[PDB]
């Protein structure tokens, strides 16, 4: 019993965190094999190719714990700077660089000065921002998922938007969303609720004994999305319906049956009642997260 | 900017997790130096659970009855002793990954990170608080017994909790790392129930100061209150009494935001009187009590927005 927001064990990632310094800018780097990946704005009309051509390998001070790492080359890939170093990290895990879609969740290891300070779980929002907990110096903190024994790096933190939300890239330097890495006016679009995730969390509530929101009713996929579109909810596709299959099978509540409960939960509200200790409908637990936390999968 | 429930990086703790097996019972152990700590109910059959004599059950066991597994390597047990509700298995090898550690016992309201393990294998990490009724609201299944709660201040890991059982209401109970239970619980299958739970008041006030630091001020009011008048209203909403120590502890946050502790208490009384009214504080529609005054100061800084 119990449903908590749970992150992946951060150990395999901690052994990769280093501190990258260029001039006055100091942020975090990800040391995998003989390369250190970090946001390219560490070298900061910012023409990054023009700013990088003027730098030498000794300008980058990379520090792994209390040991300095020797930079022997550097290249830029989109918005990420790759610093080729002298030593290959002995603690390099089995890893993969993956790009995630909105709605997908991941673990963030928040770092300051190459030293891990906290770990938390979050979701890639439909408007491509993340609602993280970041301060100055957290740039270069990474988002990951653990796949059996292989770490999947999916996010690298770059900046904070005027609304307190965060923006970053995948590990190939490609931004998530319509953002650019510079001091300019940038705004996160209107956010929507991740529908498939709220439904997964309602199945998790049923599994944990919370059944008050259930009803005898059902709906069509078209009638649900017409109401969802009105409440700023992401459209529920047939793929989403299919993905919720195992939870539907385990609880005996058909997906469109659970959609009628969400429909009533949107028009009539919580009414002083809570679902899993929450007075709001939670959207940062995917259907897979619910299965993993309510089955005991380990790494 | 941004306020999240944050756990400590679990790495230093992961390198300590092992699987302890005695007969058919299989749970987790904490391997520090040449000793493996685990709940003493690993020697119990699910039968003896009602009224077991652990001294009598341990005297009948030998070192080869305990199968300790660190990864894919078996650890050889060369001695064993019991300290309250924890079993200490002396082993042949000292853990090379042993961190700088300390066993600490915490008070209700205190927060810590939990590394949930199954079969000596870490599966997840989450942050929680020791409830006023001494239970924890964790996310645990069968086999999670022996999972540990910790705080990593500076480079030292402070072990403060070891999971033992789940109560009828879904809440969890356990001991400090010296085998002493938190609360009036016993490691027996007798009828036990968690008392009435109360809200950790000093933590809600800390979280309201964190909200002010993150820009949200809508809940603030022009009123102040006495400590006695606040507690009379707090009691009525099932809130823990706010002591003068709590008032003192909230001093730095009071200084940083410019809102006196008793002024924030009036804003809190008004929230309990009126509700949230469709508004949210730090992305929450409920008043959050699992962030201590020390967590807020740690996660936030010294510049208010
Ligand atoms: O409690 C024990 C063993 C035990 C028993 C008695 C005394 C001691 Cl000292 C130790 N281990 C568990 C720990 N944490 C969480 C659990 C969750 C569990 O199952 C969720 C669903 N429950 C199915 C039965 C009602 C609901 C089962 C077991 C859990
Ligand atoms: Cl404490």
UniProtKB/Swiss-Prot annotation, chain A:
Report the active site residues: 41 (for 3cl-pro activity), 139 (nucleophile)
Task: Name all Peptidase C30 domain ranges.
Answer: 1-299
Q: What is the effect of changing residue 183 to A?
A: Does not affect ability to cleave and inactivate human TRMT1
Localization, per the record, is:
Host cytoplasm; Host Golgi apparatus; Host nucleus
Q: How is its activity regulated?
A: Inhibited by pyridone-containing alpha-ketoamides compounds 13a and 13b. In turn, alpha-ketoamide 13b (tert-butyl (1-((S)-1-(((S)-4-(benzylamino)-3,4-dioxo-1-((S)-2-oxopyrrolidin-3-yl)butan-2-yl)amino)-3-cyclopropyl-1-oxopropan-2-yl)-2-oxo-1,2-dihydropyridin-3-yl)carbamate) inhibits SARS-CoV-2 replication in human lung cells. Inhibited ex vivo by michael acceptor inhibitor N3. Inhibited ex vivo by compound 11a and 11b.
**Cross-link Glycyl lysine isopeptide (Lys-Gly) (interchain with G-Cter in ubiquitin) residue location(s):** 5, 84
- Please write the reaction equations for the catalytic activity of this protein: TSAVLQ-|-SGFRK-NH2 and SGVTFQ-|-GKFKK the two peptides corresponding to the two self-cleavage sites of the SARS 3C-like proteinase are the two most reactive peptide substrates. The enzyme exhibits a strong preference for substrates containing Gln at P1 position and Leu at P2 position
Could you tell me which residue ranges are on the Cytoplasmic side of the membrane? 1-299
Impact noted for substituting residue 139 to A: Complete loss of 3C-like proteinase nsp5 cleavage
Q: Function, please?
A: Cleaves the C-terminus of replicase polyprotein at 11 sites. Recognizes substrates containing the core sequence [ILMVF]-Q-|-[SGACN]. Cleaves and inactivates human TRMT1, preventing tRNA guanine(26)-dimethylation of tRNAs. May cleave human NLRP1 in lung epithelial cells, thereby activating the NLRP1 inflammasome pathway. May cleave human GSDMD, triggering alternative GSDME-mediated epithelial cell death upon activation of the NLRP1 inflammasome, which may enhance the release interleukins 1B, 6, 16 and 18. Also able to bind an ADP-ribose-1''-phosphate (ADRP).
How does it associate, per the subunit comment?
3CL-PRO exists as monomer and homodimer. Only the homodimer shows catalytic activity. Interacts with host FBXO22; this interaction promotes the proteasomal degradation of nsp5.
According to UniProt, the name of this protein is 3C-like proteinase nsp5
